[PDB]
């Protein structure tokens, strides 16, 4: 208990529990974003990738 970072075993493994929970939160967010990205990639790749952007490039002020 003299090197920087030394903390009680209680704090050490409780911070572990919190770390695992936060990693779960981030993992779920990441995969959700990617799974969604894959959904619209399926829907858009089938046709009109550039036409869909151009039509509103024009409708509103470019």
């Amino acid at each position: 208990g003299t090197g920087l970072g030394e903390v009680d075993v209680d704090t050490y493994l409780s911070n572990l529990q919190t770390k695992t929970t936060l990693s779960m939160i981030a993992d779920g967010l990441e995969r959700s974003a990617r799974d969604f990205d894959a959904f619209l990639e399926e829907n858009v790749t089938l046709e009109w990738e550039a036409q869909r952007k151009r039509i509103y490039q024009h409708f509103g002020i470019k």
Binding site: G1, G5, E6, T20, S23, I25, G28, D35, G60
Partner: protein, 1325 residues
């Protein structure tokens, strides 16, 4: 033989030249000489002694000059020579300080024996004229160092021309005393009509010149000889016609005052057993007249009238003293004698001796009367108790200046005269003590008041308080007048014994019961009557008086060398022991007294108006306040622990425990610190630490294990240390000092070169015994006492290294000593077949045997060990990366590489995980029938932890209560006894069951934390890591799946270790068994969630487990089969599981609802990956989507914050639902747009706000594009009603935080563009 003579002569020459380390040398050499004399008379008793060695020995005696112990050592040798030899006999007869020679002549004449007989008589009387030596030897040889007050002066009134032996303390051997008394028995038998006639006629003719008083000396020789030996004294009572019975009939015919005194002393010594006492009692009954009880009581009456100048002659006073001593002996020894004497009016013992006591008589005669009364009341009945108390009342109240003296003045006179002298004081106080001993027995229910209640009503004498006040006034004020230390110690012993007999009979259970929740329940008339009349009320008051406290600590504080060198049974030790015991009992019953007794007494005395002198010190609000002033007490106790007296050591240790635990004393001593500096005054703090260390490393006796003096002292020391450390743990105390730590102001260090710094202190002694003890014996596995001992030591160490002050040092020293490796080495693993003191576990039925405690203790031991390991590993890992982690991990795997050739094998940590075998079913125990006493209350008794003492007292008093009513007493009683035993049996079982469960949970928490620290803090590679986690799963899973139904506390620990294990994630076999175990876990988690088990936190862990098992494991024929069986398992439970998860969402717990939201998201995702979804249909039926859309309202209020991530998961679930057709439909059906419009929702903070808008826009877009043209109108209205915002974003999109924000803007622009084109807002223009 001659070599022995030479050795003895050498020893004597050495001891004589040395006198002209040293004391111990003199003692050892005199002991050697006594052993040599013992061996010499042992040989002479055998046929080896020759004819010449006899002459040589008699020649050495002829040459002997000084009366010394060495001479006494040779008396058995001479007696054996004379017995063997005494033609050879005649020659040796003729062959035979001067008094020695005379005694030798007399001995031979008695052992070997008309002209011859005349010569024998002539020379025998010549030797006698010149017994005094024989008597002086018999007395000096057997001389106990402590004087018995009951027989003072007895056998010590004859003129002794012999010179007193020197002052050297050479104590004779017990066996040598026995041998000499055997030889004197033979001499008496050999010797057994001219002496009596000569001496008595010489007395009458010339009484002024007393001379030739040898027959009395002979009787005292008989007394000393047959003393203590009733088996040998039976020769006087075995046969009536024998010569010994004839001698007794002859010596008792005539009554010459000195001869009668000697004869009564002889009887007192002979009648030493119940049979010998009954025989003597019968002799004096006579049912040529011998001395009978009639004559004795006649003379008692005669002298009684004489005293009331008119003062008894010294010889007559001695005669009376011998009479009363013989009375006391025959009364204590025999029941028949006491019963006959106490109330056979013809004798009228009590009345006559009381009258004699009133008159003017010596201190000793009055003391003898008191001792006779004590003997009459040693055993008694409540009827005899009342009778004796009535007679004492009449004798104290009534046995001139004005008209008359009152009765209370009479009692004050009686009390003031007594206590001035030592003998009167001791005898009277011991009589009082004996009277306050209930006839039933000291330790019993003790409902009654020890004395008759009416002792006070008459003449307003306040019951017994006068007698208690007298004893205390003697103990304090009038004991100052005593000078001889031995008498002072005996008197203080008697006083403290009186105080103890008072404080014992006070049953506090009755008082606490009556106060919390009367007439007939207890044998006493009323509860308040028992409270006030009992001496306890008064005794406690005294114990608060300063003089009493001073006298106590004066009794305790004595000379240490004289104390240690004294006998354990001598008053010097017993007095200190009783003083300590009085202090302990005061500290115990203080709480009862101050709150439940003192108020009642102060209220009754005000109501009744009566009053008495208040002796308690008004400044002392608590017993402690009186002893904390002078600190020297703690030093004395610690030093006395070193004297090797078991009882005294234990008492001192318990008193130290209570002195240090109390709030008052600790508050007064340490606001540097008094107790420590006091132990440091003359360097005592170290010598008692050393003594305690040697005490806790003393050997043990396997046969005497639980009841072992060394073992009990060990437990006492450990209990003292633990109790002192538990109270005030974060500050230095007595225990910390005694262990070896250097105590600075609120800081602990180690003084260099001291005991601790060199591994010699008490702490290292604890470690040594802890690592070297072999807990499990081979024959009977797991001996309980060693288990308990290990627990005591481990909990001491645990409290030590838990506190922050001690932590650092204790942990460092434990690491330096390889403590862990030794512990893991000697820790046996539990198995079902392992017998605990010869008893298998066999489920709940094992808790009742004391071995149960051992099991519990061992669990605690295990827990403590594991806790250290965890800390150690963690503390090793964080500060640096030494090579110790490798050793720790190897030892946890069953290998220690301290020895390089072969690493010893230990059960692996997972093999150690055997304490949980749920087959026992400890928790579920049956409840008894209780046909009788069906609803006997257990309120005073008290998770639920009963106090069996109060329960048992309830049972006892309820049995008495029921007995009094008299309803089926003779027959139905046996069933009541059975009921009582069944009840207390079940209570103990319930207490131990609850304690075992607590220990098991605590051990499991320790084990789970240990494994958790291992998992994170490790340096494994992948290949060993996978197999390591497989072992972990193999260990924890069978429990977590089978026990999920039982309880929750353990399930939480096992569930979270499983969670972290799964989250921190040849090769095929390992990975397959892992996936197999992971599927087992998934199924058990599903089964637990479907049954709404445990608290929301355990369900959050389950949800985290299930979420990752679906996100990573399942998500290629193997993958398809895994997904198929996973969906099968989910569908098996179906609606219930989804119902519980949806209920958990939007709930009280913060993380449970978040985990449930994320789990539902993963569920629907994995069900889609398998055009609709059944999980989404179920959610729609359970109204989860409805309430979810509703919660979308007021979303601005909710939105790193926990609520922020919960909303993030909530919106992610909404998005994943709106992806599909029917999902988006069910979402849209429940007025989604209205919900989000009512919400009014339309660098890092801006990034989070844009992320919320992105999530919402994505939900809207997915829902619109999913179903079709039924909601495109809603999308057009949403874009037109919130236009400009879309323009703002699309114009904007066309360092780290800035890149994140710009990406979020790009995503929001993409979302609005997607919604626009999918809805066709261009077509509307």
């Amino acid at each position: 033989i001659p070599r022995c003579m030479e050795a003895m002569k050498g020893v004597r020459s050495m001891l004589q030249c040395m006198a002209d380390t040293l004391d111990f040398s003199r003692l050892s050499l005199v002991e050697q000489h006594e052993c040599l004399a013992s061996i010499l008379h042992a040989a002479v008793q055998r046929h080896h002694a020759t004819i010449a060695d006899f002459q040589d020995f008699i020649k050495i005696l002829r040459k002997w000059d000084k009366y010394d112990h060495f001479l006494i050592h040779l008396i058995p040798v001479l007696a054996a020579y004379i017995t063997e030899f005494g033609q050879q006999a005649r020659r040796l007869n003729d062959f035979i300080l001067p008094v020695l020679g005379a005694a030798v002549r007399a001995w031979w004449i008695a052992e070997h024996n008309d002209e011859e007989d005349e010569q024998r008589t002539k020379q025998f009387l010549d030797a006698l004229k010149e017994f005094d030596f024989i008597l002086s030897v018999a007395a000096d040889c057997k001389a106990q160092e402590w004087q018995d007050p009951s027989q003072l002066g007895a056998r010590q009134w004859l003129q002794r021309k012999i010179p007193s032996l020197p002052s050297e303390p050479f104590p004779f051997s017990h066996f040598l005393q026995h041998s000499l008394m055997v030889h004197l028995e033979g001499f008496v038998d050999a010797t057994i009509r001219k002496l009596r006639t000569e001496e008595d006629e010489q007395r009458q003719l010339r009484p002024n010149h007393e001379q030739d008083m040898d027959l009395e000396r002979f009787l005292i020789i008989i007394s000393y000889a047959y003393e203590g030996r009733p088996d040998a004294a039976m020769s006087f009572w075995e046969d009536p016609d024998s010569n010994l019975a004839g001698f007794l009939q002859w010596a008792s015919r005539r009554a010459s005052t000195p001869l009668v005194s000697a004869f009564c002393e002889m009887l007192r010594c002979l009648a030493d057993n119940e049979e010998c006492a009954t025989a003597a009692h019968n002799f004096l009954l006579d049912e040529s007249q011998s001395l009978t009880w009639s004559q004795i009581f006649k003379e008692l009456e005669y002298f009684t009238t004489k005293v009331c100048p008119a003062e008894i002659e010294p010889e007559s006073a001695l005669m009376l003293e011998c009479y009363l001593r013989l009375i006391a002996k025959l009364a204590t020894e025999s029941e028949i004698a006491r019963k006959r004497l106490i109330m056979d009016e013809d004798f009228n013992l009590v009345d006559t001796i009381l009258k004699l006591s009133v008159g003017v008589i010596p201190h000793r005669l009055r003391a003898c009367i008191f001792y006779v009364l004590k003997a009459l009341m040693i055993r008694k009945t409540h009827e005899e108790l009342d009778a004796m108390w009535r007679w004492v009342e009449a004798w104290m109240t009534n046995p001139f200046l004005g008209q008359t003296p009152g009765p209370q003045e009479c009692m004050e006179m009686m009390f003031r005269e007594f206590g001035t002298g030592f003998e009167q004081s001791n005898a009277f106080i011991q009589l009082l003590t004996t009277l306050l001993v209930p006839p039933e027995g000291l330790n019993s229910l003790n409902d009654s008041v020890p004395f008759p209640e009416w002792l006070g009503s008459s003449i307003r004498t306040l019951g017994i308080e006068p007698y208690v006040d007298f004893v205390f006034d003697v103990f304090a004020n009038r004991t100052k007048d005593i000078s001889d230390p031995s008498q002072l110690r005996i008197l203080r012993l008697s006083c403290l014994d009186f105080v103890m007999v008072c404080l014992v009979t006070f049953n506090e259970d009755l008082i606490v019961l009556g106060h919390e929740s009367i007439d007939d329940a207890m044998a006493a008339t009323n509860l308040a009557t028992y409270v006030r009349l009992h001496p306890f009320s008064r005794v406690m008051e005294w114990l608060f008086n300063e003089k009493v406290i001073t006298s106590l600590i004066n009794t305790i504080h004595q000379d240490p060398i004289s104390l240690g060198s004294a006998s354990p049974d001598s008053p010097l030790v017993v007095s200190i022991l009783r003083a300590i015991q009085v202090m302990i009992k005061a500290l115990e019953l203080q709480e009862t007294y101050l709150h439940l007794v003192r108020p009642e007494v102060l209220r009754y005395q005000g109501e009744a108006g009566v009053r008495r002198k208040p002796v308690a010190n008004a400044a002392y609000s608590a017993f402690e306040d009186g002893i904390l002033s002078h600190l020297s007490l703690v030093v004395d106790l610690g030093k006395y622990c070193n004297l090797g007296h078991a009882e005294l050591t234990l008492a001192c240790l318990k008193l130290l425990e209570k002195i240090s635990t109390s709030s008052r004393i600790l508050s007064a001593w340490s606001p540097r610190n008094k107790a420590i500096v006091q132990l440091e005054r003359n360097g005592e703090g170290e010598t008692i630490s050393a003594s305690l260390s040697a005490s806790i490393m003393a050997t043990l006796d396997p046969a005497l294990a639980a009841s072992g003096e060394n073992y009990r002292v060990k437990l006492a020391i450990l209990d003292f240390l633990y109790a002192c450390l538990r109270a005030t743990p974060d500050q230095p105390t007595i225990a910390h000092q005694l262990l070896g730590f250097h105590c600075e102001l609120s800081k602990l260090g180690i003084e260099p070169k001291g005991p601790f710094d060199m591994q010699k202190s008490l702490f290292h002694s604890l470690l040594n015994v802890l690592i070297t003890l072999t807990v499990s014996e081979e024959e009977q596995g797991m001996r309980g006492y060693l288990v308990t001992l290990k627990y005591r030591v481990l909990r001491i160490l645990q409290l030590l290294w838990k506190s922050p002050l001690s932590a650092s040092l204790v942990m460092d020293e434990l690491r330096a000593t390889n403590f862990l490796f030794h512990m893991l080495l000697r820790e046996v693993q539990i198995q079902p077949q392992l017998p605990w003191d010869g008893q298998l576990v066999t489920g709940c039925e094992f808790l009742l045997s004391d071995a149960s405690l051992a099991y519990i203790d061992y669990l605690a031991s295990r827990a403590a060990i594991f806790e250290y390991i965890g800390k150690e590993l963690c503390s090793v890992s964080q500060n640096r990366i030494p090579s110790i982690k490798r050793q720790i991990f190897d030892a946890l795997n069953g290998q220690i590489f301290v020895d390089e050739e072969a690493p010893l094998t230990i059960p692996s940590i997972f093999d150690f995980f055997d304490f949980i075998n749920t087959d026992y079913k400890w928790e579920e125990i049956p409840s008894p029938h209780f046909t009788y006493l069906k609803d006997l209350d257990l309120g005073p008794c008290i998770g639920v932890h009963y106090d069996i003492r109060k329960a048992q007292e309830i049972l006892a008093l309820k049995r008495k209560e029921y007995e009094h009513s008299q309803l089926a007493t003779p027959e139905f009683l046996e069933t009541v006894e059975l009921e009582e035993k069944v009840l207390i049996e079940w209570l103990t079982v319930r207490n131990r069951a609850n304690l075992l469960l607590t220990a098991r949970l605590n051990l499991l928490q320790a084990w789970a934390n240990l494994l958790l620290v291992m998992i994170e803090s490790n340096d494994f590679k992948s290949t060993p890591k996978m197999a390591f986690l497989l072992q972990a799963l193999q260990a924890i899973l069978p429990t977590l799946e089978a026990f999920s139904s039982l309880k929750s506390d353990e399930a939480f620990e096992l569930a979270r270790v499983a969670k972290v294990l799964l989250w921190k994630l040849e090769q095929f076999t390992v990975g397959n068994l892992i996936g197999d175990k992971l599927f087992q876990l998934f199924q058990l988690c599903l089964s637990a969630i479907s049954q709404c088990s445990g608290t929301p936190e355990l369900r959050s862990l389950y949800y985290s487990i299930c979420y990752r098992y679906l996100t990573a494991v399942v998500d290629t024929r193997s993958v398809t089969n895994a997904r198929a069986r996973t969906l099968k398992a989910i569908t098996l439970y179906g609606d219930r599981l989804l119902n519980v998860i949806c209920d958990d969402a939007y709930g009280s717990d913060t993380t449970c609802q978040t985990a449930a939201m994320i789990l539902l998201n993963a569920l629907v995702h994995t069900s889609r990956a398998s055009v609709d979804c059944p999980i989404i249909d179920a959610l729609n039926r359970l109204n989860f989507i409805g309430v979810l859309v509703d919660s979308l309202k007021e979303i601005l209020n909710e939105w790193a914050s926990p609520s922020q991530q919960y909303t993030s998961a909530k919106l992610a679930l909404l998005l994943q639902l709106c992806q599909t057709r029917q999902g988006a439909k069910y979402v849209l059906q429940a007025n989604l747009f209205r919900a989000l419009e009512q919400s009014g929702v339309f660098v890092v903070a801006l990034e989070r706000h844009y992320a919320l808008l992105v999530a919402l826009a994505r939900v809207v877009g997915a829902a619109v594009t999913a179903r079709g043209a039924h909601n495109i109108v809603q999308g057009r209205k949403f874009l037109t009603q919130h236009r400009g915002l879309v323009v703002h974003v699309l114009k904007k999109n066309a360092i780290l935080a800035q890149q994140a924000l710009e990406e979020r803007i790009e995503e929001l622009a993409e979302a609005f563009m997607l919604l626009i084109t999918a809805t066709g807002f261009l077509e509307y223009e």
